[PDB]
Amino acid sequence: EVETFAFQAEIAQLMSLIINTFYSNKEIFLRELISNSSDALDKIRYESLTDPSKLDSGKELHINLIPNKQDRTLTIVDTGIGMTKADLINNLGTIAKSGTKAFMEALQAGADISMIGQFGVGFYSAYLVAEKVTVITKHNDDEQYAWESSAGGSFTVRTDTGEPMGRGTKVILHLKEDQTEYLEERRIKEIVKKHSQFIGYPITLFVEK
Numbered sequence: 001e002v003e004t005f006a007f008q009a010e011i012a013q014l015m016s017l018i019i020n021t022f023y024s025n026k027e028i029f030l031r032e033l034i035s036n037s038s039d040a041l042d043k044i045r046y047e048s049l050t051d052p053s054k055l056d057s058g059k060e061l062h063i064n065l066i067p068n069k070q071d072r073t074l075t076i077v078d079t080g081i082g083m084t085k086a087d088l089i090n091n092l093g094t095i096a097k098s099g100t101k102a103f104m105e106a107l108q109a110g111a112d113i114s115m116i117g118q119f120g121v122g123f124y125s126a127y128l129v130a131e132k133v134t135v136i137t138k139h140n141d142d143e144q145y146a147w148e149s150s151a152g153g154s155f156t157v158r159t160d161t162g163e164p165m166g167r168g169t170k171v172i173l174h175l176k177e178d179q180t181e182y183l184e185e186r187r188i189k190e191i192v193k194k195h196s197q198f199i200g201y202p203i204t205l206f207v208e209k
């Protein structure tokens with residue numbers, strides 16, 4: 001059973017600005033997704049101090065980068081706190097706690113897209129390189145869900161079965177045809193070293209089979 005939702009207007013406008021603005025420095029999407037993973041990892045690490053059973057779904061706190069040239073996908077996996085169904089819909093479909101409004105105003109007052117992370121909307125930079133994004137998430141308090149969007153004002157949410165994660169989030173980027181450089185090992189290594197060298201969790205770049 002697939003549920004379809006409309007993005008809150010300001011979120012649809014933000015995605016459209018990301019998709020339509022001529023902006024060449026697209027590589028920043030990776031540090032923005034890695035930053036979200038690091039924050040989710042900080043949250044599970046903190047909660048598990050006072051409740052060690054929150055780690056029964058997995059003790060390892062890490063980030064995995066999975067390129068796949070055959071599928072034309074780049075996946076960012078973490079074992080962070082994850083999102084419940086309600087967190088998934090609110091965080092991704094609405095302004096929520098974000099600085100969506102300030103970011104859009106900032107862009108008219110001289111800011112540039114690389115500054116997206118200052119406004120709690122870095123996830124949307126995924127749309128600089130991806131035609132479609134699939135988000136698989138498992139929080140300790142809920143079942144596993146798949147969120148999906150190719151923009152155009154809507155997104156879907158369904159339960160996800162058959163490949164259960166213990167806990168965390170998987171951001172699957174179905175890359176645009178001209179954005180395949182982001183599947184190259186030396187390109188990924190270069191971006192991680194340039195923008196994510198200070199992340200306090202291991203970042204493993206998977207090798208293709």
Ligand SMILES: Cc1cc(-c2ccc3c4c(cccc24)COC3)nc(N)n1
Binds near residue numbers: 121
């Ligand atoms: C628990 C969690 C949440 C997020 C996340 C995804 C997408 C959006 C987020 C926002 C705020 C906080 C976290 C996220 C707002 O923009 C979308 N990412 C990861 N990796 N993990």
